[PDB]
Amino acid sequence: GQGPELHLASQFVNEACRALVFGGCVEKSSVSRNPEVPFESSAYRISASARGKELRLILSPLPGAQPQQEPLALVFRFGMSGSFQLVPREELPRHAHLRFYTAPPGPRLALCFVDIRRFGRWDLGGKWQPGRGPCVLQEYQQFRENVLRNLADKAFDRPICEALLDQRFFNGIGNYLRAEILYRLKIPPFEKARSVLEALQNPDLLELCHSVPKEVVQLGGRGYGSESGEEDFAAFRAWLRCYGMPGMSSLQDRHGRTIWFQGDPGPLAP
DNA sequence: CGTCCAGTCTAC
DNA sequence: TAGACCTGGACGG
Numbered sequence: 001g002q003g004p005e006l007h008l009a010s011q012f013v014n015e016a017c018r019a020l021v022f023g024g025c026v027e028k029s030s031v032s033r034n035p036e037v038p039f040e041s042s043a044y045r046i047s048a049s050a051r052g053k054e055l056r057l058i059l060s061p062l063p064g065a066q067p068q069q070e071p072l073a074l075v076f077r078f079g080m081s082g083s084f085q086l087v088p089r090e091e092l093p094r095h096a097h098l099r100f101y102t103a104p105p106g107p108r109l110a111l112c113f114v115d116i117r118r119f120g121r122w123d124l125g126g127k128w129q130p131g132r133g134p135c136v137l138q139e140y141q142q143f144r145e146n147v148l149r150n151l152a153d154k155a156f157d158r159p160i161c162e163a164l165l166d167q168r169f170f171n172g173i174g175n176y177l178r179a180e181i182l183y184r185l186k187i188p189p190f191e192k193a194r195s196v197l198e199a200l201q202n203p204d205l206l207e208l209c210h211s212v213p214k215e216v217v218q219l220g221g222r223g224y225g226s227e228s229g230e231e232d233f234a235a236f237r238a239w240l241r242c243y244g245m246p247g248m249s250s251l252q253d254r255h256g257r258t259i260w261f262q263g264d265p266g267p268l269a270p
Numbered sequence: 271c272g273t274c275c276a277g278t279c280t281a282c
Numbered sequence: 283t284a285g286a287c288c289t290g291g292a293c294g295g
Contacts, residue, residue: 079288081290
């Protein structure tokens with residue numbers, strides 16, 4: 001997922017787990033190359049926050065829970081197919097690679113990190129990935145300053161469409177978001193990044209890096225809504241103006257990722 | 271049946 | 283910088 005999907009996933013965990021109590025161990029699928037979670041508690045709560053393309057889970061034992069255990073933080077990157085689902089304990093979806101089990105009483109649920117392609121990762125510790133820039137959703141002012149104070153960086157030599165995927169500067173921006181952002185300002189995707197960013201040192205490119213992904217969050221859904229997978233999927237596809245849309249052009253960037261756009265490809269075009 | 275298509279991470 | 287990492291759906295023969 002991108003920033004909006006990670007943010008909605010964090011809201012799903014907080015909303016869905018608000019009145020739940022978990023017990024026992026954290027179970028990893030045997031095929032996951034991610035680390036075992038050394039955590040056991042008779043009674044713990046799960047909460048979440050998102051920063052860009054990362055999600056932090058906090059496992060917080062209730063007072064008197066046994067065995068003795070301090071809160072534990074886990075940080076997730078979702079890759080191409082990461083998600084969280086709350087399911088019945090004996091109806092685990094395929095590719096549920098990490099599970100947290102509700103304690104009794106009541107219906108036995110499992111909170112699952114589900115990842116079909118297994119591009120997703122998690123680490124022990126609550127640390128955000130070093131070198132990842134500030135969250136375009138939740139840390140806009142820090143994000144904007146971090147870009148404008150580092151335009152000398154060789155990252156800004158590249159086409160703007162490629163610079164927008166660089167997570168040191170645009171933490172949370174992925175492939176659909178770069179197409180939607182550039183389309184709203186009609187900025188050619190193969191314009192030089194430094195030229196577009198020097199020009200802004202009237203909502204501009206850095207502001208849309210915040211307000212555009214925020215619209216996706218405000219839509220809700222993306223697999224985390226009150227509405228079915230069909231209704232959430234229709235609402236998202238109705239919101240897209242550029243990415244995959246008929247009448248739009250598409251090219252491969254230098255890493256073979258497809259950029260969608262209208263009109264002028266821009267000067268650094270392959 | 272087959273090919274193509276949908277974000278990091280690492281070896282050159 | 284190219285290839286690796288992986289599964290499932292759309293689609294073509």
